[PDB]
Design a protein around this ligand. Structure first.
Ligand SMILES: COc1ccc([C@H]2CCC(=O)NC2=O)cc1
Ligand SMILES: [Zn+2]
Length: 106
């Protein structure tokens, strides 16, 4: 019905509703970057079709204990969110910008 998440700009397969991850009790986190941009972030245990840019950085990380790398759509290059690593339980996860994805059938 609506179990697959694709890149909104090009349709690249990214994630699934089954792979949503409740972090802090909720898979949705609203955050701001240092430029004041608001993001409605959904946390996923797993994702595909991305391209992770650069090396991890902990600066300004919204999630305690985690370092982030920019995650672009591997197909069109749109900024879809961030990959997080270096933490504990889980050690890694994806934070994806909800409004840059499109939900649909398998
Ligand atoms: C270009 O400067 C920056 C620096 C950091 C950020 C994001 C990265 C992800 C995160 O967890 N927290 C942030 O604030 C956005 C833009
Ligand atoms: Zn794309």
């Amino acid at each position: 019905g609506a179990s697959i998440f694709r890149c909104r700009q090009c349709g690249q397969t990214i994630s699934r509703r089954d792979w949503l991850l409740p972090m802090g009790g909720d898979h949705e986190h609203v955050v701001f970057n240092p430029a004041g941009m608001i993001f409605r972030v959904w946390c996923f245990s797993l994702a595909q079709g991305l391209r992770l840019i650069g090396a991890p950085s902990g600066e300004f990380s919204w999630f305690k204990g985690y370092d982030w790398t920019i995650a672009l759509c591997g197909q069109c290059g749109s900024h879809l969110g961030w990959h997080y690593e270096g933490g504990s339980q889980p050690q890694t996860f994806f934070g994806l910008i909800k409004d840059r994805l499109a939900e649909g059938p398998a």
